Design a protein around this ligand. Structure first.
Ligand SMILES: CCCCCCCCCCCCO[C@@H]1O[C@H](CO)[C@@H](O[C@H]2O[C@H](CO)[C@@H](O)[C@H](O)[C@H]2O)[C@H](O)[C@H]1O
Ligand SMILES: CCCCCCCCCC
Lengths: 1040, 156, 144, 96, 48
């Protein structure tokens, strides 16, 4: 292949240009995102029961849906929440690689055949089935600067004139509204109702009758009579359109002949469907849209597409209505990309400098400057073929591979510049001989490198999904690099490189270059002399090698392991948790204190605060809240003091003297769609119908034993809410029947008045929306208000609730949890400093087995993933090691010589561990792929040394020591060039403090440390390995 | 609105016997009340924490403290089968014939859940067997409605 | 694929203006399109024009005064003039629908409305003419 | 049956239309509501979209608007079909 | 039509570049390919 393209340099160019074009075309049309699908696919069933408590939702909706969730393929586990806001969420999580479309439809199909079993009230609200495993692209916030519109006024415009047009934008998937469109509110008055002998039942009945859309046929309709002249639609009652029309609804005609209209017993206004969530943006009323990205959709296009489409409606907006962006992940993706491209360009101009230091001409310095970019571009075309995206993992995958791609360029160009200077052959002839020596090794190296990286993709779960991004990326670029090295770099070498005089090593030159050439020639002689001495007493250095294996093994166990490093993404969360029974108003005071602090004490760092009243991660209700803190650009936040981790700790400490309310600030995890990743996720399960009260006792018993081991376990806490005082009202069936009061009139009056009731739909400015009846606030606040409500008996008399009802205080759950269709309580926590998660999990299991009979447990989330991805971790290392050996065995045609290469692995590892341990970083995926690319490059250096040594012994019949010392002399310069260019290439990544620096630090540190040691140690040990391995494992061959 | 008052309420609910003792010594109000009018003695009785009931009564807690709907520690203890706590409360002068806002008594609630042992102890301390709730129901009526013959025999 | 020659334009109401105001805007665009025969040719609406509709109003007061249920009224009007699918039957072993409707000659003209009686709570039969008024009004036979 | 254009639009069409979101590869949606009590909502997808995946995602969204439709409309049956296909032939049947 | 408009010129450009590179590889020349690609309009004039 090389010889063919050496004779045809333009053919070589044509192939490279085609690869560049294919690459550049892929780069344009490839989807760009922060991460790919890491989190296992998850489908969420969402339903609501207006007015219903946690237990009413659980026992009429949740359990019914859960019992029908069977005959579904690839289901790992199922979890559900049923809360005091009448909301249920059932989450079905499927195995990694499950078709999300097939998962959703199989869940929907099972839900669809439980729909007739659900309460009509729940069906009317609509039971959504959605893919929840996807992450928020951005949050569009909407406010009115004029202060004319309330939260409900804004929410209506966003729902009715935005939500849909946004869903239609290019690359947009799921969309969720911060509030609801207008509902027609009938705020009933019990004084006025009682005065005219009326109840909520009569109101609802009157609304359904007088707010109706009636089908009335046609004049001259089919089948007609002969001679019919006119055909015309008949229009009867149509849906009401205004508060006025709803006010005119005639409830009854009195005996005296006077009229009771709906407006005589109720206040009538456009309001929200629900009032359980209050959203603010820097203290002023707000709505918004949580937009999600679609399958293989460009995040940078979707973001720009929405911002352009929203600016197209700017003129159509009413006065004051402004679009804001409190949460956007587009700015972080643009920097993450720009920083990676900067690293790739910096790495190329660094190879240019190192190539001009050693070879000292602009003709040789351009070959790696052409070949490396071609491969980088070509990789994208390969990634496009596999269906991959441009993301943090694939992007850093190329940064980690640059050492391998740069080497393939240097190795080829150096070996020609060596042969020309040593032998005096012309460029075209020098390249043929030079390529003849390495061609076979480069192919062998490719098979070996494949066996190192490919098995990394066959990891299961979310960790495997992360790993597979690096695996395919590194193997793809590496495979192209070897192809370019057998086609273009030979052709370019034969045509571009000028000849060198035999024995000319540039020591006849003057100035700096003259000094360096004389300096390095002496250094090369000193190196061969030093190795020559080392080879005469190998025994000593084998003991030094063992000390490194022991030293490595020690540092490896001592070094803690993390998922992925935390990043400043220009956003963080503040959660608010008031005590049991705490009201919306009290929670709003605390969010206002939190909002004021950020716009005051962090005025320089914070851009906006999006305060959300009535939603938390532990659960939702009036005693929970959240604040999306949107930071100013990184360019306006210099120093570690003005970073997310610093502002976080400053805020959490500032919220210590807070007026009895738990307020914590925390940074987002690297992958938000995964959640925390640090610590464990335990599920305590009732498996004998014990009940919720007994499950709490068992939970409390486990948490108390967990607190007895602060040595092992730390912050072992429940994820859910505690039981709160509930107002339990009992109806006396006897007294109800005695007075002639229907139990249906009672429960409808109580329900519709205190809970609210969705009656039917109406037409608001041409759009269909809901009609709700409910008590005006002031008649449904306190227990004494119960006696204000009258029901009409059969005899026509009005009976108060106090007649046929009693009430008492009783505790109950505001948030009932279930796991795999059984009552559960989720318990979070982590291993204490020094201890591992595996050790902590082992203790929790032993504590759980002391709990009462009927109480079981299970692992979920990242604990389930870890427990699974454990038995396969060693086997994939074993598969990799065996295949590498067999590849090396085929290349060298020997069962023994491969060991001389495979012994070089720990030389690179010791450096990474020391560098990471010294700088106090963790054993994350960036560090682990860093080792493999370090081990791979150190192995490649050993393969080329052993090749040259073995070649000289076979091809020229040289002695073991002569061939070994000849090999290391020839292979020193190219090793030191690659090592230097790459070490300089990753230096900006180590000192990086800006945006995305968490990942860069993890990549650079382990690589720089690992390369330093691998470089220095290998050049001395590789020849020791060959000599020892060849002497021990050989028949009566020759040391001469 | 004392901080140590709110801690005692939370502490007495979870059953922290030693944290109660500490808060008592620190000078925390024994008769601190919830939004719903529950004291530590209400919570200790409800969740069935005997030692805390004994510790609170030793530090001069109101044994006849009533919530916003007129219910007392004895109501809760008698209702949910905490026999040992019913005895202690009654030993410290608990109103055996205490009426909540519904006219319901400890004897009604005990009879409702068929707690025979508690019913017999309440009767020993002079519980009015003929006591009527707002609907005119006696403990005996409740026992008949529930079909509890053993309990009906005792109240006849 | 359909036609393929010419263009396909959609005029959209994006401020809850209403159907009558969308027509005005449509007519305004078609009139400007006719002013450019040089560029545009046969610029026409794909849909139907508004037609006379027989709008009948029920007097809720008079209905309650006479003791006539508004449900009996709308079911009588609906089932008689529109037709109503009641339930299924078995025709030669195959399940098919049962429809109730007025015979043609009693649901042709406005005067036929007064032929239809509803029964009040008191048991008396009240004609539609008692509790209803009617007028001609334009509306869409095809809303897009 | 018996419904006018506006009755069909404001009880059937708008209700179904409001639930046509979270559907992949949707270019545009159009609907007719007429005086014969008939509604047709047409969802056109991008070239190369899996027609089976398109139909089922529409059906799944319609299925959770069914309880909001008038009983009279539900009883008639709400069909979801691939309309992009063309007529092979029309069989006519007469009695001589 | 409004959609399939921006892509019409680029696909002609992609086609022209690849034809040139194919001819360039065949003849081993950057110049000689032009001698072939100049023949395009000779067939087009007749069709039109
Ligand atoms: C020679 C070494 C090889 C190095 C090359 C490595 C390439 C890796 C990064 C490729 C990313 C380029 O991908 C491209 O990014 C730009 C923004 O930068 C996006 O473009 C987006 O932002 C620009 C900002 O000007 C907007 O005008 C545009 O409306 C929007 O779509 C494209 O949607 C995306 O296709
Ligand atoms: C052959 C005896 C000399 C051994 C020492 C060689 C130098 C080693 C330096 C690392």
């Amino acid at each position: 292949m090389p010889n063919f393209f050496i004779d045809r340099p333009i053919f070589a160019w044509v192939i490279a240009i085609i690869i560049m074009l294919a690459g550049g075309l892929a780069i344009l049309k490839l989807p760009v995102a922060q991460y790919p699908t890491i989190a296992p696919p998850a489908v969420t069933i969402s339903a609501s029961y207006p007015g219903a408590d946690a237990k009413t939702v659980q026992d009429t909706v949740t359990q019914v849906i859960e019992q029908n969730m069977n005959g579904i393929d690839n289901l790992m586990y199922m979890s559900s929440n049923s809360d005091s806001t009448g909301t249920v969420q059932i989450t079905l999580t499927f195995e990694s690689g499950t078709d999300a479309d097939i998962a959703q439809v199989q869940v929907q199909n099972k839900l669809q055949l439980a729909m007739p079993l659900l309460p009509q009230e729940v069906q009317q609200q609509g039971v959504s089935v959605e893919k929840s495993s996807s992450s928020f692209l951005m949050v569009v916030g909407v406010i009115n600067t004029d202060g004319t519109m309330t939260q409900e006024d804004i929410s209506d415009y966003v729902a009715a004139n935005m939500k849909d047009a946004i869903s239609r934008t290019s690359g947009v998937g799921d969309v969720q509204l911060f509030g609801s469109q207008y509902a027609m509110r009938i705020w009933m008055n019990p004084n006025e109702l009682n005065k005219f002998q009326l109840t909520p039942v009569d109101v609802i009945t009157a609304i359904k009758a007088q707010n109706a859309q009636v089908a009335a046929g046609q004049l001259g309709g089919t089948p007609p009579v002969k001679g019919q002249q006119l055909n015309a639609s008949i229009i009867a009652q149509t849906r009401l359109t205004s508060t006025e029309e709803f006010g005119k609804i005639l409830l009854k005609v009195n005996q005296d002949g006077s009229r009771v209209l709906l407006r005589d017993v109720a206040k009538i206004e456009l309001g929200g469907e629900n009032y359980d969530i209050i959203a603010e943006f820097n203290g002023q009323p707000a709505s918004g849209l949580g937009i999600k990205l679609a399958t293989g959709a460009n995040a940078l296009d979707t973001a720009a597409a929405i911002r352009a489409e929203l600016a197209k409606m700017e003129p159509f907006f009413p006065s004051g209505l402004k679009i804001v962006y409190p949460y956007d992940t587009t700015p972080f993706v643009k920097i993450s990309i720009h920083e990676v491209v900067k690293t790739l360009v910096e790495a190329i101009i660094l190879v240019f400098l190192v190539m001009y230091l050693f070879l000292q001409n602009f003709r040789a310095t351009l070959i790696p400057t052409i070949a490396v970019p071609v491969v980088l571009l070509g990789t994208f075309a390969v990634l496009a073929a596999f269906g991959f995206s441009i993301n943090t993992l694939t992007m850093f995958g190329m940064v980690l591979a640059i050492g391998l791609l740069v080497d393939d360029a240097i190795v080829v160009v150096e070996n020609v510049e060596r042969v020309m200077a040593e032998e005096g052959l012309p460029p075209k002839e020098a390249t043929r001989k030079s390529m003849g020596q390495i061609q076979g090794a480069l192919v062998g190296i490719a098979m070996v490198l494949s066996a190192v990286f490919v098995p990394m993709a066959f990891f299961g779960g979310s960790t495997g999904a992360i790993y597979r991004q690096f695996s395919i990326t590194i193997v793809s670029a590496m495979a192209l690099s070897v192809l370019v090295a057998l086609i273009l770099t030979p052709a370019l070498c034969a045509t571009m490189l000028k000849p060198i005089a035999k024995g000319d090593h540039g020591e006849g030159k003057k100035g700096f270059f003259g000094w360096f050439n004389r300096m390095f020639e002496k250094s090369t002689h000193h190196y061969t002399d030093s190795v020559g001495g080392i080879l005469r007493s190998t025994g000593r250095y084998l003991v030094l090698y063992l000390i490194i294996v022991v030293g490595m093994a020690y540092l490896f166990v001592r070094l803690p392991s993390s998922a992925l490093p935390d990043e400043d993404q220009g956003v963080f969360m503040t959660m608010v948790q008031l005590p049991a029974g705490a009201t919306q108003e009290r929670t709003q005071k605390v969010l206002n204190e939190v909002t004021h602090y950020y716009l005051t004490k962090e005025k320089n760092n914070v851009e906006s605060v999006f305060a959300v009243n009535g939603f938390g991660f532990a659960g939702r209700g009036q005693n929970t809240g959240i604040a999306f803190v949107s930071l100013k650009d990184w360019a306006d936040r210099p120093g570690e003091e003005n970073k997310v981790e610093a502002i976080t700790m400053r805020a959490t400490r500032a919220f210590s003297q807070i007026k009895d309310a738990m307020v914590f600030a925390f940074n987002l995890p690297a992958i938000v769609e995964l959640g925390t990743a640090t610590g464990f996720d335990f599920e305590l399960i009732d498996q004998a119908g014990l009940g919720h009260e007994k499950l709490t006792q068992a939970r409390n018993q486990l948490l108390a034993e967990a607190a007895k081991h602060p040595d092992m376990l730390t912050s072992v806490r429940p994820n859910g809410l505690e039981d709160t005082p509930q107002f339990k009202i009992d109806i006396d069936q006897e007294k109800a029947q005695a007075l002639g009061v229907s139990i249906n009139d009672i429960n409808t009056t109580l329900g519709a008045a205190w809970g609210g009731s969705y009656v039917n739909d109406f037409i608001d400015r041409g759009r269909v929306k809901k009609v709700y009846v409910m008590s005006e606030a002031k008649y449904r606040m306190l227990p004494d208000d119960i006696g204000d409500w009258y029901v009409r008996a059969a005899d026509g008399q009005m009976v108060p609730f106090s007649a046929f009802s009693s009430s008492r205080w009783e505790y109950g759950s505001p948030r009932l949890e279930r796991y795999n269709g059984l009552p559960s309580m989720e318990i979070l926590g982590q291993a204490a400093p020094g201890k591992s998660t595996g050790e902590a999990m082992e203790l929790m299991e032993q504590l759980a087995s002391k709990l009462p009979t009927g109480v079981g447990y299970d692992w979920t989330g990242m604990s389930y993933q870890e427990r699974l991805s454990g038995n396969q971790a060693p086997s994939l290392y074993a598969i990799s090691l065996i295949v590498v050996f067999l590849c090396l065995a085929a290349l060298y045609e020997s069962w023994s010589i491969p060991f001389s290469v495979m012994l070089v692995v720990p030389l690179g590892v010791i450096g990474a561990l020391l560098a990471a341990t010294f700088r106090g970083l963790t054993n994350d995926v960036y560090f682990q792929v860093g080792l493999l690319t370090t081990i791979g490059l150190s192995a490649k250096n050993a393969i080329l040394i052993v090749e040259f040594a073995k070649d000289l012994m076979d091809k020229e019949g040289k002695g073991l020591i002569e061939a070994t010392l000849d090999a290391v002399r020839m292979r020193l310069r190219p090793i030191l060039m690659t090592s230097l260019a790459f070490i300089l290439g990753v230096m900006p990544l180590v000192i990086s403090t800006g945006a995305g620096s968490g990942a860069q630090n993890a990549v650079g540190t382990g690589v720089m440390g690992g390369m330093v040691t691998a470089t220095v140690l290998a050049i001395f040990f590789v020849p020791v390995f060959f000599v020892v391995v060849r002497r021990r494992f050989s028949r009566k061959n020759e040391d001469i | 609105g004392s901080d140590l008052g709110k801690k005692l309420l939370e502490a007495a609910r979870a059953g922290r016997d030693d944290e109660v003792r500490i808060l008592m010594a620190n000078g925390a109000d024994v008769n601190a009340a919830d939004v719903v009018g529950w004291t530590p003695l209400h919570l200790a009785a409800y969740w069935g924490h005997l030692e805390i009931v004994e510790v609170l009564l030793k530090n001069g807690a109101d044994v006849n403290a009533y919530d916003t709907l007129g219910s007392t520690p004895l109501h809760l203890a008698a209702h949910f089968g905490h026999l040992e706590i019913v005895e202690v409360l009654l030993k410290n002068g608990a109103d055996v014939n205490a009426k909540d806002d519904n006219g319901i008594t400890p004897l009604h609630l005990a009879a409702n859940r068929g707690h025979l042992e508690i019913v017999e102890v309440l009767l020993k301390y002079g519980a009015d067997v003929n006591a009527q709730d707002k609907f005119g129901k006696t403990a005996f009526d409740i026992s008949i409605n529930n079909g509890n013959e053993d309990l009906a025999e005792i109240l006849q």
